């Protein structure tokens, strides 16, 4: 959550996280949620909304992030680890923006 704060999230439009709480594989995506939801990252820009989509049946956890490059970054955490998602997020959404 700190490495996201240092990186100036203001280049982002909308961040949603779609996941399924009763699956065994979702801990990673959750960790991502609480990393982006933190006060530092949340207050870097007020133009960005963070939406948590919670469903029992969907069965596939997902993270979708739009930003003002006209870019859409969608990472499906299934077997992906938390800090791999956050590193991918950092190098992807910072270097472009």
């Amino acid at each position: 959550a700190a490495a996201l704060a240092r990186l100036g999230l203001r280049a982002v439009k909308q961040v949603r996280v779609q996941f399924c709480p009763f699956e065994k594989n979702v801990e990673s995506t959750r960790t991502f949620l609480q990393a982006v939801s933190s006060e530092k990252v949340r207050c870097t820009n007020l133009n960005c909304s963070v939406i948590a989509d919670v469903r029992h049946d969907g069965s596939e956890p997902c993270v979708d992030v739009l930003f003002g490059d006209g870019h859409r970054l969608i990472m499906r955490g299934a077997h992906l680890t938390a800090q791999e998602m956050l590193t991918a997020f950092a190098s992807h959404i910072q270097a472009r923006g």
Partner: protein, 45 residues
């Protein structure tokens, strides 16, 4: 013991066993026991 497993939106067609055996025990009654039933439910609620 253990509790329910929480089925949800995309597919749940499944209604409980209790409601069904209740409407069955309701449907098996003669109309005098249906009026008795109706009075005993009208009074308590």
């Amino acid at each position: 013991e253990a509790l329910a497993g929480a089925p949800l939106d995309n597919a749940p067609k499944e209604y409980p066993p209790k409601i069904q055996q209740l409407v069955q025990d309701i449907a098996s009654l003669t109309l005098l026991e249906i009026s008795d039933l109706n009075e005993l439910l009208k009074k308590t609620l």
